[PDB]
Ligand binder design. Structure first.
Ligand SMILES: *[C@@H]1O[C@H](CO)[C@@H](O)[C@H](O)[C@H]1NC(C)=O
Ligand SMILES: *[C@@H]1O[C@H](CO)[C@@H](O)[C@H](O)[C@H]1NC(C)=O
Ligand SMILES: *[C@@H]1O[C@H](CO)[C@@H](O)[C@H](O)[C@H]1NC(C)=O
Length: 295
């Protein structure tokens, strides 16, 4: 039967619904035929291995807005039909065992926003070949290691804003051939490797505003042949000789772009790099140092 104060019904999908009823733990005796399990808004602190293993046909599991501090690495083992997993708004989770998501080959959406996550461990997203949406915003990430998303060939939306990512290495986004939207704003990005976006030929939206970029090689943006929306505002852009390549790329860009506000030199403060004449970019505003500032 139906456990605790949960509500169980069959249409449109077999559902076990137990939201906001003061649960401290995952209830036992969840009906095995459950296709959807809603446990959001309680005070659940742990997800043991045995939690959902009877539920063969499970496709949707919501655990957002709880008090999750730990998830057993075997919590979601054998849930081969799982399509939606929501662990968001558990700000004290901090860490997910790198094997937690292994075997989830039907997973389409993974909500990990506002989980206080400190890092993306090796192999955390291995084998998630069906994943389309990955929410990682508003965590505590301080790195984007190479090949973190290597197997995510069907991913279309990747949200990484509201972290503390300091830089983007060459192969951080390797394998993301289907990616359409990449949100990297409100981080600490000080540099992007020249070939970091090589595989993003189908990207349509890129947000990089509210970071720490003083410059960006044109090579960074060159592979983004499908780009339609670009945001680069709220960065400390240096509008001198080092900006000439980005300037030139911007002149030919047919999409929509934010302001690219100059921070230096003072005479160009808050004017748009995009809207400057090439003659404004002569010289060096500093006089670690870019090539044109050495010659
Ligand atoms: C999954 O759904 C099928 C309906 O085709 C049903 O026969 C089966 O018992 C369900 N699985 C469980 C564990 O109840
Ligand atoms: C990836 O998407 C394609 C087309 O959208 C689909 O044929 C394929 O089955 C998807 N991959 C997985 C693992 O579901
Ligand atoms: C931006 O990065 C530079 C690295 O040269 C560093 O000196 C500076 O403190 C950073 N600014 C902020 C606001 O983090």
């Amino acid at each position: 039967p139906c456990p605790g104060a949960c509500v169980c019904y069959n249409e449109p999908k077999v559902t076990t619904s137990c939201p906001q009823q003061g649960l401290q733990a995952v209830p036992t005796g969840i009906p095995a035929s459950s296709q959807r399990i809603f446990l959001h808004g309680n005070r659940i602190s742990h997800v043991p291995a045995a939690s959902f293993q009877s539920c063969r046909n499970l496709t949707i599991l919501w655990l957002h807005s709880n008090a999750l501090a730990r998830i057993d690495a075997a919590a979601f083992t054998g849930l081969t039909l799982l399509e939606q997993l929501d662990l968001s708004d558990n700000a004290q989770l901090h860490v997910v065992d790198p094997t937690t998501f292994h075997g989830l080959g039907h997973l389409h959406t993974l909500h990990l926003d506002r989980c206080g996550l400190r890092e993306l461990g090796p192999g955390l997203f291995r084998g998630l070949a069906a994943l389309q949406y990955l929410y990682l915003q508003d965590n505590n990430l301080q790195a984007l290691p190479d090949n973190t998303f290597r197997d995510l060939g069907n991913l279309t939306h990747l949200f990484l804003h509201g972290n503390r990512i300091p830089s983007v290495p060459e192969h951080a986004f390797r394998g993301l051939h289907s990616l359409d939207r990449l949100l990297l704003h409100q981080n600490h990005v000080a540099r992007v490797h020249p070939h970091a976006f090589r595989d993003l030929g189908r990207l349509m939206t890129l947000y990089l505003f509210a970071n720490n970029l003083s410059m960006l090689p044109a090579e960074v943006l060159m592979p983004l042949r499908s780009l339609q929306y670009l945001r680069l505002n709220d960065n400390p852009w240096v509008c001198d000789c080092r900006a000439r390549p980005l300037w030139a790329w911007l002149q030919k860009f047919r999409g929509s772009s934010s302001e690219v506000p100059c921070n230096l030199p003072q005479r160009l403060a808050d004017r748009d790099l995009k809207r400057l004449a090439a003659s404004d970019l002569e010289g060096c505003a500093v006089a670690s140092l870019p090539k044109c500032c050495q010659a």
